[PDB]
Design a protein around this ligand. Structure first.
Ligand code: ADP
Ligand code: MG
Length: 188
């Protein structure tokens, strides 16, 4: 199974993804294999998110290529894959949907975020606190433009459903309730 995490920059994707992993770890042991992938695990710097000429520096399109390959190598009916990345484009989320389809395994989307304001605050504290890291800040130019071009998951579309969301204020049990529906979704 594939679980597409999605959210704004510094919206809590990695934090929620860890919780999901720990949850899925207890549930598998109470079978499946558990995989975790992120920009950091693939050494994809956040600066990729900033035409007629071929360049040597990796593009955002190459980042999606890297992510796509990492998932295909492990994703399968017996392999649960957590993709912790912005995953902010409907088309990209549609590619991942078709990827899980080709792996003959269910897919879902898990949106995270405490808000544009609480997310902006985080990136400032991480900019203040000064590269394959989970706490490396974005440049304020790259951060703002990323939020502007974020595409909200649409449960009306089959590739953004089943959709699940987790606000920051959602406590350990409301988060735990979502995780159970994720589990039931990626089963029979
Ligand atoms: N429910 C949450 N509640 C409180 N703080 C959070 C929450 N989610 C994320 N954070 C905090 O905000 C910062 C960003 O979290 P992180 O998961 O690393 O964002 P990103 O999705 O960009 O990787 C972290 O310091 C983290 O502790
Ligand atoms: Mg992350």
């Amino acid at each position: 199974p594939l679980i597409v995490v999605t959210g704004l920059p510094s919206s809590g994707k990695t934090t929620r993804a860890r919780q999901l992993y720990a949850y899925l770890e207890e549930r598998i042991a109470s079978q499946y294999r558990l995989h975790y992938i992120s920009d950091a695990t693939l050494s994809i710097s956040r600066s990729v998110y900033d035409a007629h000429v071929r360049s040597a520096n990796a593009s955002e399109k190459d980042a999606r290529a890297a992510l796509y390959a990492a998932v295909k190598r492990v994703l399968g009916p017996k392999d649960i894959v957590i993709l912790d990345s912005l995953n902010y484009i409907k088309g990209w989320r549609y590619q991942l949907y078709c990827e899980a389809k080709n792996a003959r395994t269910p897919s879902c989307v898990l949106q995270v975020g405490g808000g544009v304001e609480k997310a902006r605050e985080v990136n400032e504290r991480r900019l203040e606190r000064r590269a394959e890291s989970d706490e490396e800040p974005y440049e304020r130019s790259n951060w703002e433009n990323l939020v502007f071009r974020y595409e909200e998951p649409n449960p009306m579309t089959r590739w953004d459903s089943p959709l699940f969301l987790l606000a920051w204020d959602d406590d350990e049990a409301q988060t735990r309730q979502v995780f159970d529906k994720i589990w039931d979704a990626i089963a029979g």
